[PDB]
Write a protein that binds this ligand. Structure first.
Ligand code: NA
Ligand code: NA
Ligand code: NA
Ligand code: NA
Ligand code: NA
Length: 206
């Protein structure tokens, strides 16, 4: 399946793509303002994610650091990124269908739209100014708006036991972005698409 990743932000981002234990395609690449990078994701990929990283430096071997979304200091991500990270999430060819969503469970760094480029289903978007409106206690000094599990490490925010409810913090993310997951047990905003659809992830869509 193809995913076109487009940076409409005014600043450079380093895109990343991983399924947690391996890179998807090359795993990461720099996108200057306006640039597009198309990756190929194997059919059947379960639990894949795409995100933006900000304020990165990499040496000529591909090793360095980013202030949001860093994946073990690699340009070409093999693992998931360090919060805060707005997440485009997907599982492909699961009993004939694809499933997509956007999640704020690991915080928010960059606004995003995640839409199919083929027929049969709708896209989802979280493009509100979550960083600007972020509650004081969730602001990350390194940049972005952390989720409450990252900040406070409680069973209630991290849903450790699989029993948890909404919180003042989760309701902030849900108010600004109703169509994204705000906590682990949120009422799902997953979209079902035809199996083998293709997609576009756009950073700073508005
Ligand atoms: Na992101
Ligand atoms: Na969603
Ligand atoms: Na997230
Ligand atoms: Na909530
Ligand atoms: Na898009």
């Amino acid at each position: 399946a193809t995913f076109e990743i487009v940076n409409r932000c005014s600043y450079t981002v380093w895109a990343a793509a991983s399924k947690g234990d391996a890179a998807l395609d090359a795993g990461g690449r720099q996108l200057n303002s306006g640039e597009s990078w198309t990756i190929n994701v194997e059919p059947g990929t379960n639990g894949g994610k795409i995100w933006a990283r900000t304020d990165c430096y990499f040496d000529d071997s591909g090793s360095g650091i980013c202030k949001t979304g860093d994946c073990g200091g690699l340009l070409r991500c093999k693992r998931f990124g360090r919060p805060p990270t707005t997440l485009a999430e997907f599982s492909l060819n699961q009993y004939g269908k694809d499933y997509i969503d956007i999640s704020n469970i690991k915080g928010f760094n960059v606004p995003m739209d995640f839409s199919p480029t083929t027929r049969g289903c709708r896209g989802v978007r979280c493009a509100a100014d979550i960083v600007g409106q972020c509650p004081a206690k969730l602001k990350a000094p390194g940049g972005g708006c952390n989720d409450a599990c990252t900040v406070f490490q409680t069973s209630e925010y991290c849903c450790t036991t699989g029993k948890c409810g909404p919180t003042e913090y989760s309701r902030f993310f849900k108010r600004l972005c109703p169509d994204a997951f705000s906590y682990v047990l949120d009422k799902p905003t997953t979209v079902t698409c035809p199996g083998s659809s293709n997609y576009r992830v756009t950073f700073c869509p508005t």
